[PDB]
Amino acid sequence: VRTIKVFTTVDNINLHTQVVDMSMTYGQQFGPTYLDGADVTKIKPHNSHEGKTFYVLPNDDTLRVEAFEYYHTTDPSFLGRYMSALNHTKKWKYPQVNGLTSIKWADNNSYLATALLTLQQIELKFNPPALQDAYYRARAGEAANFCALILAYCNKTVGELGDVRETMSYLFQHANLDSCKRVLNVVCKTCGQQQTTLKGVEAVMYMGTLSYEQFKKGVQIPCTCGKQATKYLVQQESPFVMMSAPPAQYELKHGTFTCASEYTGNYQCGHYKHITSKETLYCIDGALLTKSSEYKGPITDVFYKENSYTTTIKP
Ligand SMILES: COc1cc([C@@H](C)N2CCC(C(=O)NCc3cccc(F)c3)CC2)c2ccccc2c1
Numbered sequence: 001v002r003t004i005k006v007f008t009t010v011d012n013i014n015l016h017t018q019v020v021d022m023s024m025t026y027g028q029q030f031g032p033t034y035l036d037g038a039d040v041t042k043i044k045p046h047n048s049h050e051g052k053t054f055y056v057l058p059n060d061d062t063l064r065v066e067a068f069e070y071y072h073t074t075d076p077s078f079l080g081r082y083m084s085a086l087n088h089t090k091k092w093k094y095p096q097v098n099g100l101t102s103i104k105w106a107d108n109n110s111y112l113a114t115a116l117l118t119l120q121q122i123e124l125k126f127n128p129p130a131l132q133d134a135y136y137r138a139r140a141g142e143a144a145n146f147c148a149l150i151l152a153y154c155n156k157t158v159g160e161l162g163d164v165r166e167t168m169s170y171l172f173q174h175a176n177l178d179s180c181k182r183v184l185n186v187v188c189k190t191c192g193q194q195q196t197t198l199k200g201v202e203a204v205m206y207m208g209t210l211s212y213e214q215f216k217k218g219v220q221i222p223c224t225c226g227k228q229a230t231k232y233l234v235q236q237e238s239p240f241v242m243m244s245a246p247p248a249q250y251e252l253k254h255g256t257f258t259c260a261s262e263y264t265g266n267y268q269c270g271h272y273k274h275i276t277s278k279e280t281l282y283c284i285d286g287a288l289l290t291k292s293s294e295y296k297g298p299i300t301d302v303f304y305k306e307n308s309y310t311t312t313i314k315p
């Protein structure tokens, strides 16, 4: 009987020494086993595997504790989905486009590239240590693990089309939006006591209008009756705000926003591009980059910097 020494882990932090019989497969001795994103459950240990680290499913209780401490989820399939996604995202390209890490287009990753480009331009802190380690490694240029994790946290798969706003919501759930708070006032003769206060994801997100200044001044509620119900922002305390609206022809003025998302197409087939404001306006589409002084396009998401805003409108 011949043998090799390997390591097994669920977080790449706590490694476990393992004696492996080379006459069996990794699936027989460990369960579902992954080697750098690759599935090696059906493969027998090779001599080259000596001293290398393998991912396995949380089969015992200590591994479950380690996996939860790293990923902040109880989903047992999470590691499997993450490894399956990494098996593809390791083959993607991540070029530095205008100081940001983008993704060369493949397998309908347009929304993924836009989300990755957005996250690099907003002050945001993640709670899962896995997310934070992959975030740093993505800003450094190795975003494969980051993309696979984002796919795993959103219950999306490689090749499936995605929405940037949905992805941003899923990731904001795993973010430290604690101090973030939003206070709004509903103006209508019916409503004579509307001082709504929101904390959490809904403190930094809104779906209705793209303009943040038009949100501060006032916008009409989608009332089916048309009661001229008015909504304006009373107070905002957050490092950023994300204004979303159905894809509409919008004029992006330089210096008035941080970044924005353009969506060209219909509902079941479209393409995401990312617009950023630097010294001029830049459009990143996968690995491609364009510049201009002005921009008008089908916008759907706009991000703005914020710290503390207080309204001027007295009730
Ligand atoms: C009225 O609200 C919208 C919103 C969108 C944008 C924001 N958005 C784009 C991605 C899209 C999506 O998830 N596509 C994948 C998909 C969805 C359903 C069936 C499939 F097979 C595949 C979700 C929505 C709009 C984008 C384009 C046109 C109208 C939109 C209206």
Ligand SMILES: [Mg+2]
Pocket (backbone or CB within 6 Å): 088, 089, 091, 107
């Ligand atoms: Mg591929």
